[PDB]
Each structure stands twice: as C-alpha cells, then as structure tokens.
Amino acid sequence: SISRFGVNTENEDHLAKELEDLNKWGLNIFNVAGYSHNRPLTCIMYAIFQERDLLKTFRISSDTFITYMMTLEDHYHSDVAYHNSLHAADVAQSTHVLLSTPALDAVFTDLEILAAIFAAAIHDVDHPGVSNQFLINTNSELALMYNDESVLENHHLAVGFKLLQEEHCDIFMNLTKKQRQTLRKMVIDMVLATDMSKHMSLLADLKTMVETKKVTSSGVLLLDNYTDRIQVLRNMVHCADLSNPTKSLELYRQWTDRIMEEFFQQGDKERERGMEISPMCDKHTASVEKSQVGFIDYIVHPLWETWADLVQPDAQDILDTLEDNRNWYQSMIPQAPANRDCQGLMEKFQF
Template identity: 35%
Template sequence: MQSLNCVCLRKREELLISKHFREMLDQAEIAAICISAVVHDLDHPGFTNPFLCNSRAQLALLYNDKSVLENHHVSLAFRLTEDSENATANIFQSLDGATYREMRVSIIDMVLATDMSQHFEHLTKFNALMAQDTEAPGQGSAVSLTKEGQEARQVLKRILVKCADISNPLRPMHLCREWAERIAKEYFSQTDEEKSRDLPVVFPDFDRETCIIPNTQTKFIDFFITGLFEAWDNYCSVPELLEQLSSNYEIWKSEAESPTPSEDDEH
C-alpha cells in the first residue's frame, strides 16, 4: 500500500524533532509514533477489510470481522519482536515492564486508528479537542492541547499517523500519480476477484474496464483528505502541504473533466 518516503512523512519527522513537539511528547511517545508508521501496513495481503469479511478469509475469522487488517498488522509486528530465533528483532527488550506495556497500548491504538471505517470518529474527536483549545489555531496550540490529558495526547498521535497513512494526495504530483495508479491496480484485482467469486463489489469505481483514476482521486480527496488536513493545519500549520494538495486536486479535476484518449484507453 502507501510508501513511507513521502512529503507528509518528511514533514512528520520535522515536526517530531522540533521544539514544538518536544515540549509535549516524550521520547517513548515519539518512538511509538515512528514504530506505528512503519508497521501500520505490515504483511498487507492487497485486499480490503470488507473483502476479507465477505470472503470469510481466515484473518477475518481470527479477528471477528473487526479492523481485520489493522489487528493483523500490529499483532504480527509484536509477534516478530518475540521471535526466539532472532533476538535482535526485539526492539523492546531494554524497556522495563511498565514502559513496554504503555508503548504497546499506544502503538496498538495508533495502528487500529488507521482503519478507515473509523476515520470520521477520530477526526471528530480531534476537532472537538481543537474547539476546546484556547490558543490561536496554528500558533502554538499544540502545547496547550496536550494539557487536556493522556486521551488528548493519544488522539493527537492517532491523527498524526492517520495523516501519514493516507498522505499520497499531498505528494509531489509525479509521485502522487504513480502511487494512485498502483493502488488502483490493487483495487482492480480485488474487483476482479469479487466478480469471479460472486462476492459484493466493495469499490464499484475500481472496475478496470470503466475506472477513470482522476475521478477516484477527487472523490477520495473530497471525502477524506481535505477535512483531515485542514484540521491538521489548524493544529500546527502546514501550508505547503495544503498548497500541494490543492495543486494536485486541480490537476486530477481537470483530467477527470477532460480525459485524454490515452487515459480512456489505459483505464
């Protein structure tokens, strides 16, 4: 799925080492955020949660149809650290019991939050916290926000990892296009599989015979991306990301409205 070497994650790294974030997150929390970002799609099978549930896949049966992929990613990550044949994989071995338990709870929480079926629930909580904040938006409100307590800090961390997870629309356009096409091909394969097995088609827009990728991108940005990154910008000010998002959106919109013959043939 999404690669980690993108503009959003570079921005995340800059934020995490900045004074702005050092004042509110300790080293264990920063480590947990980075680990969550690394493992959040570990061993992804190339199918969505609804497909796994509809097809009665073993993972869906194992996790009772609840955040199936996200549970698998984070469970496997921790199981790999307990591999007795590879002691160097245990990145937590030097932690005391209390710190390990706290970090484990935090990582699990952040990875599970990447389940897109819960997207608006997490965004609503984040916006509610922002509304309670008395500091001026984008002018240091990060520090006062975390004074609300541990739950507020965890909401912040969820949103940070979520921004990294679905940040492709904010990449430079040549990278954004490359990954949009790769993801579309993955969804095409799922749709093919659903049709061949007479399963519900989860994403009808991603039919390889009819799909217009620019349409799928503008819909995704309108539905999920704009609100999330406007909220994040209100929190810590990332105008360059919003500028890139706006530029990419206009390109996708133009292509959706006037597809070229080559695009029609390709998609």
C-alpha cells in the same frame, strides 16, 4: 551497518544525496528504495532512528534494530501494488516529519515519538492487498479470528509485535516493563485508528480538540494529559497515512497508480471467485480522476484542513500542494458530458 543493506559505496553516495531530505516532506522514498535494494522501510527507519538518537535512548543495538526491521519489512508483500513496504516507509518518514512540526516542539516524550514512528512502520504489515470486507465475504480465517472487526488492522498489530520474538528481533528488550506497556497501548491505539471506517469519528474528535486548543506564549501547543497526546498522535499517523495527495505531483501520481492497481487486482480476485466486483475495483468503470477529486474534497482535505488548524501555520504549504494536486486531477477528468471503507468512500464521494 551498510553491509547489512548490501549497498556499495556508489549507491551509498546516491543515498547520501537522497537522505538530505530525510526531515523534509519532499523526500523521494521511491528513490530511496531504488538505491537500497528495495528495503526503503528498513533504510528510512534506520536513518530516522539515527537522526533522532532513538537507538541510544532506548538501548537498541543497530544489530537488533536492523534484524527486526528487515524481518518486519519482509512481512510486507512486495507483490501488493500499494500496501507494501514502500507505503509503510512513506508513512513512517512522513510521521517523522510531522512529529517535528514547530507547533508540537517538546510536546511528546521519547517513548511517544518511538511509539508513533513504530506504529507507522508496522501499520500495514502482512497486508494481502484486499479490503476487510473481502476477507469477511470470503469467510477468511482471519475474519473469523477477529470477529469481522478491523480485521487487517488487528492483524498488522499482532504481526508487528509477534515478530519481536524472532531471533535477535526484540527492539524493546531494554525498555522498562512500564514503558513497554505504555508504548504497546499507544501503538495499538494508533494502528487501530488507521481503519478508514473510523475516519469520521477521528476527525470529529480532532475538531472538538482544536476548539479547546491551548498554546504557549511562543505558540507551541499544550498537551499535558495522556488522552489529548494520544489523540493527536493517532490523528498524526492517520494524516501520514493519508498524505499521498499532499506530496509533489510526481509522487502523488505514482501513489495513485499504485492504489488503483491494487484495487483492480482485488477486482480481478473477486471476478475469479464469482463475487460481485467491489466499488473502485473495476478498471473498466473506475474514474480515477473523479475519485481522487472526490476523495480529497470529502476525506483528505477536511482532515488536513483540521490538522493545519491545529498546527497553524505549520501545514500551510501542505494545503497549497493538496489544492494544486486536486485541481490538476479535476482538470485531467476526461472532458466528459455534463459505504465506510476506503473503496466505498471513493465511489460515493466521486466528483
């Protein structure tokens, strides 16, 4: 209901224009946030669920859905530069687009589609704007609870599911016990997979799958067993999570400005607490351009190249944009002279 969003007819008309790109890679989620009183995750998720008739299929009332989504979205930190609800909204919408790629047509069940989009929506909830290592190094209660392993990722999941218990928030109330068990299994799998420390293993497994790749007479992929389906889904969400460099430059630049701002803020916290500054977190040493080029060359491109292979020729335009964006950043490198976590990777592979 538009009233729950507090949007007037004028901005509702603006949103109607923006949402024409709901099923497109070119959707501008920044504009959606601007016309929805900064509730891009709830707005885009509502639009997605309506578009896919998910509310109908799973007997989720608009009331329960919006209440839960607004609750979830409010648990993202609006003062965190990158890992906020705008990023979650972007990953959710990007996942929604990837799910409809021709090569995957009719491959996934409605429960798997629900699980993937839900996973994308909650994958960074209650993110503090600092890395797992920062939490571990400060002897954070969170790190102690999760034994220093995928600390934030485990937390995002715990929060995402815990919020279903708040008043009028159980969007899975009408799923069968079996469906809830299966969806929960898949969501946990996908969110845990967003831990950048698992990237290399994910890509390797994905490549191994592309080898045994099977298609139909029309070209559609064939995934008849659960293990292969969840493997594609976990990589799909991971790709959506790493899709910023594949969007139009106007968007990509904003995403980059944001992640750097977030890294710099962690750097400020480290300096404030007498800690050594983490890689990429010192604005007076960080090479933004070099870092993006290196990150694309060693992490993003390899991943998307593999995904494109799996769904060829579906993701060709994405690869072209990624290439153009990479070369733009390489050109922007101030005319100069001659680990296993995002921050460490960006510093290591720095071009």
